[PDB]
């Protein structure tokens, strides 16, 4: 009844949306992106995303493939394991298609709580 269901979705998307820039900046250097926190690794030429998996207590952030070099589709997911009953277990997926470099957002939330710019 009183779950903050719209704000949960907005918060989840706000945790992953800024990582699009992080990914693009690494790929433009010809470096790979890897999950988690840490320093750039000049031996393997990997840049970490810079955010902990649990930075937002609504859920968990994941990257696939890990590491990612831009020659395959990339997905960033926010899995809402920490949310209330309407959104628990739902997943927001950002996909960067390697063929064209374009990003899409899909969600399996109930349509009324899907954030702006994302589709089913």
From Swiss-Prot:
<dbReference type="GO" id="GO:0043107">
    <property type="term" value="P:type IV pilus-dependent motility"/>
</dbReference>
<keyword id="KW-0812">Transmembrane</keyword>
<dbReference type="GO" id="GO:0016020">
    <property type="term" value="C:membrane"/>
</dbReference>
<keyword id="KW-1015">Disulfide bond</keyword>
<comment type="subunit">
    <text>The pili are polar flexible filaments of about 5.4 nanometers diameter and 2.5 micrometers average length; they consist of only a single polypeptide chain arranged in a helical configuration of five subunits per turn in the assembled pilus.</text>
</comment>
<keyword id="KW-0472">Membrane</keyword>
<dbReference type="GO" id="GO:0044096">
    <property type="term" value="C:type IV pilus"/>
</dbReference>
<feature type="disulfide bond">
    <location>
        <begin position="105"/>
        <end position="118"/>
    </location>
</feature>
<keyword id="KW-0281">Fimbrium</keyword>
<keyword id="KW-1133">Transmembrane helix</keyword>
<dbReference type="GO" id="GO:0007155">
    <property type="term" value="P:cell adhesion"/>
</dbReference>
<protein>
    <recommendedName>
        <fullName>Fimbrial protein</fullName>
    </recommendedName>
</protein>
<keyword id="KW-0488">Methylation</keyword>
<comment type="similarity">
    <text>Belongs to the N-Me-Phe pilin family.</text>
</comment>
